[PDB]
Write a protein that binds this ligand. Sequence first.
Ligand SMILES: NC(=O)c1ccc[n+]([C@@H]2O[C@H](COP(=O)([O-])OP(=O)(O)OC[C@H]3O[C@@H](n4cnc5c(N)ncnc54)[C@H](OP(=O)(O)O)[C@@H]3O)[C@@H](O)[C@H]2O)c1
Ligand SMILES: NC(=O)c1ccc[n+]([C@@H]2O[C@H](COP(=O)([O-])OP(=O)(O)OC[C@H]3O[C@@H](n4cnc5c(N)ncnc54)[C@H](OP(=O)(O)O)[C@@H]3O)[C@@H](O)[C@H]2O)c1
Ligand SMILES: NC(=O)c1ccc[n+]([C@@H]2O[C@H](COP(=O)([O-])OP(=O)(O)OC[C@H]3O[C@@H](n4cnc5c(N)ncnc54)[C@H](OP(=O)(O)O)[C@@H]3O)[C@@H](O)[C@H]2O)c1
Ligand SMILES: NC(=O)c1ccc[n+]([C@@H]2O[C@H](COP(=O)([O-])OP(=O)(O)OC[C@H]3O[C@@H](n4cnc5c(N)ncnc54)[C@H](OP(=O)(O)O)[C@@H]3O)[C@@H](O)[C@H]2O)c1
Ligand SMILES: Nc1nc2ccc(SCc3ccc(Cl)c(Cl)c3)cc2s1
Ligand SMILES: Nc1nc2ccc(SCc3ccc(Cl)c(Cl)c3)cc2s1
Ligand SMILES: Nc1nc2ccc(SCc3ccc(Cl)c(Cl)c3)cc2s1
Ligand SMILES: Nc1nc2ccc(SCc3ccc(Cl)c(Cl)c3)cc2s1
Lengths: 250, 251, 252, 251
Amino acid sequence: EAPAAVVTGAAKRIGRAIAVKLHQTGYRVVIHYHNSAEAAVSLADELNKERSNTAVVCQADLTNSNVLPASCEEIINSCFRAFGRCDVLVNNASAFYPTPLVQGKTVETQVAELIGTNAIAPFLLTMSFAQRQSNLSIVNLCDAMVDQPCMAFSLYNMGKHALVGLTQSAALELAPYGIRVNGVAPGVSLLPVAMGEEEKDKWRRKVPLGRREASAEQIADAVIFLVSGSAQYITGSIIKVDGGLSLVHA
Amino acid sequence: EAPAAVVTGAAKRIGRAIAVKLHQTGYRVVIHYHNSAEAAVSLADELNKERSNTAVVCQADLTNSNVLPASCEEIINSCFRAFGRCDVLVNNASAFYPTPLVQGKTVETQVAELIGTNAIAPFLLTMSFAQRQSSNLSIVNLCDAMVDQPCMAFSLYNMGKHALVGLTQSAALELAPYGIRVNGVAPGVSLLPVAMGEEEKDKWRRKVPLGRREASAEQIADAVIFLVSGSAQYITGSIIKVDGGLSLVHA
Amino acid sequence: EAPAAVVTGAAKRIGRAIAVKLHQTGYRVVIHYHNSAEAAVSLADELNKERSNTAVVCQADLTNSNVLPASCEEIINSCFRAFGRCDVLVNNASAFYPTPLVQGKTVETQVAELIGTNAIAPFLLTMSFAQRQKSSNLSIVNLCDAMVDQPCMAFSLYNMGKHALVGLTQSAALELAPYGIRVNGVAPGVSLLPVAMGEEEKDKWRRKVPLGRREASAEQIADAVIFLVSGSAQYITGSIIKVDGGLSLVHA
Amino acid sequence: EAPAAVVTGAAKRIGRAIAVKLHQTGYRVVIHYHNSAEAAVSLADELNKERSNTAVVCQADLTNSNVLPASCEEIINSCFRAFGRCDVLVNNASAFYPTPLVQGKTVETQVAELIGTNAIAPFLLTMSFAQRQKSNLSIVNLCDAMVDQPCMAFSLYNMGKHALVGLTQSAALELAPYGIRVNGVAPGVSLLPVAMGEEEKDKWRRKVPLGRREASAEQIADAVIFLVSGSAQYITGSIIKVDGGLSLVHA
Ligand SMILES: NC(=O)c1ccc[n+]([C@@H]2O[C@H](COP(=O)([O-])OP(=O)(O)OC[C@H]3O[C@@H](n4cnc5c(N)ncnc54)[C@H](OP(=O)(O)O)[C@@H]3O)[C@@H](O)[C@H]2O)c1
Ligand SMILES: NC(=O)c1ccc[n+]([C@@H]2O[C@H](COP(=O)([O-])OP(=O)(O)OC[C@H]3O[C@@H](n4cnc5c(N)ncnc54)[C@H](OP(=O)(O)O)[C@@H]3O)[C@@H](O)[C@H]2O)c1
Ligand SMILES: NC(=O)c1ccc[n+]([C@@H]2O[C@H](COP(=O)([O-])OP(=O)(O)OC[C@H]3O[C@@H](n4cnc5c(N)ncnc54)[C@H](OP(=O)(O)O)[C@@H]3O)[C@@H](O)[C@H]2O)c1
Ligand SMILES: NC(=O)c1ccc[n+]([C@@H]2O[C@H](COP(=O)([O-])OP(=O)(O)OC[C@H]3O[C@@H](n4cnc5c(N)ncnc54)[C@H](OP(=O)(O)O)[C@@H]3O)[C@@H](O)[C@H]2O)c1
Ligand SMILES: Nc1nc2ccc(SCc3ccc(Cl)c(Cl)c3)cc2s1
Ligand SMILES: Nc1nc2ccc(SCc3ccc(Cl)c(Cl)c3)cc2s1
Ligand SMILES: Nc1nc2ccc(SCc3ccc(Cl)c(Cl)c3)cc2s1
Ligand SMILES: Nc1nc2ccc(SCc3ccc(Cl)c(Cl)c3)cc2s1
């Protein structure tokens, strides 16, 4: 029957665009969310109106804790319960905010949220995906600017660097099971809702190819390629989708 | 009406698969060749039987010399003459052989072939392509996923492939204002050299994590087709490995 | 006055050689340890015999937990209480063991130990070091891994922690450059091998190394640390020096 | 006896600072130069006054040509003829100027100068150095910290510095069995070009996180001195950035 995919943080923005394009391609989808319950249920409604019984939501907090392994097992189990299989995992959910080294959240909360969502949750989701196991693959949303990082984002950048490590280590370890593991690395795509217009335009003007941010759909297009049969020899690769931003010197 | 692509070294192996798959996607194609005239014409005959007047051949030596710039200008010119436009350049042609540092062809001939075909010809072709320019214009360079874990005694070849990464990044930056994207595809082990013995071929296949086999030429071509497509319109300066995980494997 | 350095995991092997060479260079040293108290104290006593009042020990578990930030603050504070200054931090301590993705510690313990020692503790130590600073040559050296992009099979959590440490090295280099604090790494390939590893297995690794078919001594790793903290490296920040005999260049 | 080193492009700037610091460490030096004869001889005179018979000059044009191999052979031979040994090779000489892809030297001259000096001459010197061996032998290549974030319109220069990364890695691998280590030093901004106005210099200076200033020549030479030293005896195939953080700064 139709393959099934889990997309984390799929209620809004890039994860929503990935869930939509997978669904358009033929997948049944689990729409994971944390706080955005109305947007999650609304997307599932839209996808199920298009093909009945092809979308479910699954709520979970991907902050690191001693129950995060159970939450990640539950996300994968939700896909098997709804659809009887789980072919694709997209690790899209992410906390993103500054953590300056020199001075409402305590530092161990910042560690738990930024390292948990960007790295530890992907690892545990990978573990659960592999253990429960056509064209199986995992796509991790990485960051094209990981080696040219934003000032005062050390914990975020540590998380994204750890996600590169996971993409490589899991590609190596899961290749014998036919599971491919790859990444998509945006530069500037949909800018943070909290950011003012002048700051957004500052970022847009840095991008060589068009002086504009990527659409969510342009990031989703690279995800679709990597899960497709046109990528069946590709594993351990991270595709930058940044309009050349990472090539630009200071 | 139909876009047009140039593929260098297109008579055989990976460049032939790239030309076939572009043609199948609806491109008109220039099949460039150096020594493989019969094979080049055989492919053009096959593509033209499918759709008339959609494939031409172009002979050129891509060794570095005083005449390489004129030759590269002629390859690009052939596409404009045949088809009225040139939307895609695939730099696929490549010399590959060892050049030991501690001791046939003189060393400066080895330089001209390994650095000329793998790096200088792509640079000159890129200059000609850009100078002659809605549209979806892009260049794809055939790179090598093992550029940082090179084969023993292949220094000039490795130098040429590293220079091609530099051209990919430099040209992506400089041509972005013209809407020209520049990207790479980096195979690991794909079609093994004809000269290689069967036992040595098997030793390499056994190293690959994903299925213990080499990439087909069509699996390499699939990544080229993605990068020239509308699904890659924000991608420039990216090199996609297509290596089955081989570059992740420690010694 | 003599400058002062904190070296984590300094009782044995590479951290011990780093602490010895820094002391030989004229630093006073805090020898941090977790379980190896006898070896830590034996080194501090040897160092104090060479020059009185130039070495102290500091015990702490660097596993991630709610108390890790306090522990890491106390390690930096110990250097200021002993010596009145803290010029150099070497993030050397590390947990290292396989964590297979597929079928007696729980996975959250594995996460706490591998990501805590290799990445979170270095970040918290870096925060505490910088906060206490806000003639001088201040720097941090992180012990990285030359094989981070060609990792050992079934070491995903170890490899994630060492990739996070590359990120820390780069992010902290950029953010601390205004304060004159340089942040660099040294990335061994194969150095001192596990103690009870059979010679026949040690030889399998040694034979992979192009330069000399042998592992690095601890002292060879320490030499790169000494260069990075020296006045000969005063424009170097954000750099990771491989000390791996060419091992990372070797294809499968 | 004292060891001996060749430094290419050593009459001025960074290559002079490297030759001076090697000479202060106890090396005998060959000061290679191309056009800077007055400056080369003046430096050798200063070093000879300090310790007699410890410095010679050697003239050569490192542009690629069919005689570049003989010129490279002769630079290494100059060191054996003056001092009876050659322990260290520093590949410092470099051409640097823009080569825009979209438009008085011909393009083939630009290729010969920018790829010859930055990549092929280091390769041929590496071959000559290795073949003349019968101690702590090493080669240091002057690379560029900004090779992955290149200056607009410098594609040939960037190609040559990428190829020099490939040579560094390939030669470290291949020469390790002979005990020759091969490493790189990668400046960001150091001594700015003499042609550059102060306003333009300050634009570059302000980009550098560590001190908002360029590296001194002596700071670059310090990293060379470390890599040839006994404190780097297990280091091969490493490129050390000396860039004050510049390569970490986003656009
Ligand atoms: N946008 C860009 O320019 C850009 C650039 C580089 C990289 N990326 C990467 O691309 C991916 C998608 O980008 P984006 O801008 O779409 O992401 P985003 O809107 O910042 O975050 C995506 C979703 O992550 C979920 N999330 C955050 N904290 C969580 C937690 N503790 N538990 C569970 N889920 C949590 C949130 O779900 P709820 O709303 O349900 O709470 C959120 O809507 C991310 O991995 C990002 O780092 C994006
Ligand atoms: N096969 C692999 O496993 C592999 C692995 C890594 C990277 N790659 C890269 O992928 C690309 C395609 O690989 P491949 O195995 O298909 O290549 P290949 O068969 O070695 O060479 C492709 C064509 O290059 C042309 N060529 C060689 N020297 C030339 C010259 N002096 N002037 C003009 N053309 C010349 C030849 O055309 P004529 O036959 O017409 O003379 C040859 O058929 C190459 O860039 C290669 O470096 C391949
Ligand atoms: N040896 C190599 O070949 C090699 C290769 C690549 C990278 N490296 C890196 O180089 C550095 C030094 O290597 P090494 O072989 O000397 O290290 P090691 O012997 O594996 O570990 C060093 C010390 O880390 C401390 N440590 C472990 N878990 C800890 C925890 N939970 N809390 C606090 N401290 C803890 C231990 O201190 P106690 O003994 O006091 O408990 C141990 O003595 C490490 O970062 C390592 O990853 C080494
Ligand atoms: N300066 C920086 O900020 C910086 C930044 C990044 C990388 N680097 C690298 O660091 C190294 C030293 O930099 P620099 O500024 O000192 O170099 P430079 O002054 O630009 O060039 C050094 C010497 O190269 C020689 N050279 C040029 N063309 C030559 C040819 N055709 N044949 C033989 N020699 C030739 C010249 O010797 P004569 O004067 O004798 O003709 C020149 O004095 C270079 O490799 C450079 O690319 C420097
Ligand atoms: N989870 C998310 N990760 C990232 C990563 C990068 C970006 S766009 C670049 C950018 C850079 C700096 C700031 Cl302060 C901001 Cl708000 C945004 C946006 C997001 S959203
Ligand atoms: N132009 C070409 N470049 C390359 C690069 C790699 C390969 S397969 C890997 C490989 C590795 C080692 C040897 Cl000795 C040989 Cl012949 C081939 C085949 C080709 S054909
Ligand atoms: N804390 C530590 N980190 C590292 C990283 C690498 C190495 S040597 C390589 C190596 C690789 C695999 C195995 Cl199983 C073993 Cl035991 C040793 C040894 C250590 S000790
Ligand atoms: N052989 C040489 N290579 C380089 C590389 C960089 C630099 S400094 C930065 C810089 C950057 C851009 C321009 Cl246009 C100029 Cl003129 C100078 C100076 C030199 S000198």
